Every structure is written in C-alpha cells, then in structure tokens.
Ligand SMILES: Nc1ncnc2c1ncn2[C@@H]1O[C@H](COP(=O)(O)OP(=O)(O)O)[C@@H](O)[C@H]1O
C-alpha cells in the first residue's frame with residue numbers, strides 16, 4: 367500500500383443503520399484503515415461537557431479533527447460516524463449515507479436496549495432524514511450517495527459496489 371494514493375470514505379447515517387458492520391467488512395476486504403469515531407473518542411477520552419437531555423458525554427469535535435488529521439492527509443481511511451458537519455470537507459473523496467426503513471431500524475435499536483426517549487429521538491432523526499441532509503449540506507452533491515441498509519443482501523451489494531469504486535479511484539489516481 368506504501369506509495370499508493372488511497373481514497374478516504376465517510377460512512378454516516380442514524381445510529382443502527384449499519385455503518386460499523388459495513389465499515390469493518392470494507393476494511394477487511396480492501397486493506398483500508400477503519401476508524402470508528404465514537405470508539406476513538408472513548409479510547410482517547412475526547413470529550414468536553416455532558417449532555418443533560420440525551421445523557422452522554424459530549425464529543426470534543428476539534429480534538430477529534432486534530433486526532434485524525436494527519437492520518438486522513440495520508441489517505442486510505444474509512445471513517446464511521448453518525449454525523450459529519452464538523453469534519454474538514456477535504457478529508458473525504460466520497461460520502462455514503464446509509465438508510466434504514468424506520469420499522470427495521472426500530473427493531474435494531476430496541477434490541478440495543480435503548481429506552482423510549484432514546485428510541486424516539488433516533489427514529490425521528492432517521493424519518494426526518496437529518497443526517498442525510500447534514501451530509502448534503504457539508505459535501506458536494508455529486509460525492510454524497512444514499513445506500514439502502516435493510517437486508518443482508520444489501521450489505522453485500524454495498525460492500526461490492528464500494529470495493530469496485532475504490533479499485534477505480536485507485537487506478538484513476540495512480541496513473
Ligand atoms: N444491511 C443489513 N442487513 C441486516 N442487518 C444489518 C445490516 N446492517 C447492519 N445490520 C445489523 O444492524 C445492527 C446495527 O448495525 P451497526 O453496524 O452496529 O450500525 P451503526 O454502526 O450504524 O450504529 C447490527 O445488529 C447489525 O448486524
């Protein structure tokens with residue numbers, strides 16, 4: 367992988383849509399580095415403030431950017447986070463917003479043990495297409511794509527289509 371130009375990919379969308387499942391499988395099958403922003407924030411304790419209503423530490427956005435910037439500059443990173451408005455626009459060559467039918471997403475999040483308030487917040491987030499709109503506001507239209515993420519066959523199609531995009535991008539950028 368040394369001395370190859372490699373792309374960076376954002377996987378975004380409501381909690382429960384399948385970002386981590388897709389990201390880890392993509393990294394295994396491409397050799398690109400997988401980064402879970404929530405896990406990274408946990409491991410490196412990148413928090414500032416506590417959110418009273420949602421009951422969780424608040425992500426320190428500047429510190430996350432500082433933590434990751436050098437790696438992103440070097441390329442070949444798949445980043446997984448529900449949001450995207452604070453990332454430098456230059457980081458990503460393509461952005462995928464995974465989408466899940468509300469009925470399907472609810473069962474996933476219920477299985478996680480989310481309580482009523484948290485289930486409702488996330489379910490509304492998806493039905494209002496909040497994170498899709500956040501992606502389109504933050505990145506060029508042409509590099510933002512919605513991916514269906516309801517069934518295992520769709521996960522496989524998503525993996526296949528992205529692996530193929532990665533191969534073409536690498537060819538196009540290592541003439
Ligand atoms: N395309 C899919 N089809 C069926 N189940 C899926 C799909 N993608 C993810 N899942 C399942 O949905 C749950 C949430 O996926 P996860 O990758 O943790 O979501 P996120 O990281 O977006 O919160 C997991 O149980 C996972 O196995």
Ligand SMILES: [Li+]
Nearest residue numbers: 381382484488
């Ligand atoms: Li969550």
Ligand SMILES: [Mg+2]
Nearest residue numbers: 367368369370
């Ligand atoms: Mg090489």
Ligand SMILES: [Mg+2]
Nearest residue numbers: 385386387446
């Ligand atoms: Mg996840």
